[PDB]
């Protein structure tokens, strides 16, 4: 199965700017009949995908000429001369030359803004939850930019990955920031025989991580 | 130019489901057609394709012999039969026609949830900080089916509010809601999250109280 890889994962632009998206195949998409069945689809938030470009460089009906497709063999590019609000969404490339038909993983065209460090909060398990025999420790990493970030949990100073679930918001429609929650769910047993609980946020706005901690016993 | 999927529903693991796609605004019997699905991670997967007459059918290895695409040109309708469904088949299912490209025009989609979960109210827990602004939260844990709604002070707090997307914990959903207010607002004034889970007739208020 041929693999379609898109770069970058996310492309932050200002309205007005030029944009370029790359699509690569793990093997040549040039069909034996001389065609290259490389296609581009746009999916706007909350909407269905729409065809933009087919056969590498042919714009589909209605698509404005600020869109252009190019490339050959394994390397392909979608360009936007001047990005408009209606262009924001996820762009997927697609190959139709080889069995089976395959989509790339997508590139999000999103809004550029100033860098912002995350505001990090840690929340000990409520007493009410502990009555039910459970203990969820929650960490918010709020209103940061750019979207890339990672969170690390430490229990009694030691890293912990089991029982951690993360959730990421889409880019905020008001201030163009991103947020993420991390929830470490433990049994009452596990929670009550450890004491030091730490959420560590790593983001490009700082050389050192943002550390938030509490002690269970306190 | 109109494509309308239907048939999506909640179905148990191991179960079957038949999806339909009603078309209008074009010569139905002229076009080959496809099913494509979007998983919760927003990845797109081609599921099946059928020729204009229904003579030829195409599937990826992953669903070959398990899914069946068919069509009724007299009724302008496309079908997808699915069997032995698993949790990973939870997705939005889109029908399309092919001409210039593989999927020239798409429908709005129909939603399939594969799960054996029963209706279950959330447990609502306050998030008070273990510490200019202050951030409070509410944990909405272990509910089914989607969705829940969370407001703060009955909607009086709109700025600095966001609710994280639900995630599957076991086969139940969980999310949290966040609210940020000026430091002089709380705890001087009360801050309460209002949680609703319509499917289970749940309406819960939880006041946030400072931690030791």
């Amino acid at each position: 199965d041929v693999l379609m890889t898109q770069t970058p994962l996310s492309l932050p632009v200002s309205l007005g700017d030029q944009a370029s998206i790359s699509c690569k195949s793990s093997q040549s998409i040039v069909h034996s009949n001389g065609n290259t069945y490389l296609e581009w689809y746009l999916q706007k938030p909350g909407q269905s995908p729409k065809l933009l470009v087919y056969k590498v460089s042919n714009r589909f009906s209605g698509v404005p000429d600020r869109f252009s497709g190019s490339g050959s063999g394994t390397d392909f590019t979608l360009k936007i001369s001047r990005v408009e609000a209606e262009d924001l969404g996820t762009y997927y490339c697609f190959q139709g030359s080889l069995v089976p038909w395959a989509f790339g993983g997508g590139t999000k065209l999103e809004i550029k803004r100033a860098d912002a460090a995350p505001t990090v909060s840690i929340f000990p398990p409520s007493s009410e939850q502990l009555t039910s025999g459970g203990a969820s420790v929650v960490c918010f990493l709020n209103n940061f930019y750019p979207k890339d970030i990672n969170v690390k949990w430490k229990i009694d100073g030691s890293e912990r990955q089991n029982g951690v679930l993360n959730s990421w918001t889409d880019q905020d429609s008001k201030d163009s920031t991103y947020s993420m929650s991390s929830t470490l769910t433990l049994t009452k047993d596990e929670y009550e025989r450890h004491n030091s609980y730490t959420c560590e946020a790593t983001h490009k706005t700082s050389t050192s991580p943002i550390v938030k901690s509490f002690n269970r016993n306190e | 130019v109109h494509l309308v999927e239907s048939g999506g529903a909640l179905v148990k693991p191991g179960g079957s489901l038949k999806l339909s796609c009603a078309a209008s605004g074009f010569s139905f019997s002229k076009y080959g057609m496809s099913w494509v699905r979007q998983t919760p991670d927003k990845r797109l997967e081609w599921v099946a394709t059928i020729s204009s007459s229904g003579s030829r059918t195409y599937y990826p290895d992953s669903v070959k012999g398990q899914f069946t695409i068919s069509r009724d040109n007299a009724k302008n309708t496309l079908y997808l039969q699915m069997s032995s469904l698993k949790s990973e088949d939870t997705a939005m299912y889109y029908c399309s026609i092919s001409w210039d490209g593989a999927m020239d025009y798409w429908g709005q989609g129909t939603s399939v949830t594969v799960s054996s979960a029963k209706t279950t109210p959330p447990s609502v827990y306050p998030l008070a900080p273990g510490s200019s602004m202050v951030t409070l939260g509410c944990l909405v844990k272990g509910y089914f089916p989607e969705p829940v709604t969370v407001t703060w002070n009955s909607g009086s707090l709109s700025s600095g509010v966001h609710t994280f997307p639900a995630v599957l914990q076991s086969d139940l959903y969980t999310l949290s809601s966040s609210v940020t207010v000026p430091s002089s607002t709380w705890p001087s004034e009360t801050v309460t999250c209002n949680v609703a889970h319509p499917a289970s007739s749940t309406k819960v208020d939880k006041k946030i109280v400072p931690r030791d």
Binding site: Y37, Y54, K55, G96 | K30, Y31, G32, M33, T49, I50, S51, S52, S53, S55, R56, S98, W99, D100, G101, A102
Partner: peptide, 8 residues
């Protein structure tokens, strides 16, 4: 018959 020859 279209790009992918699906028109019979």
């Amino acid at each position: 018959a279209g790009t992918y020859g699906l028109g019979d």
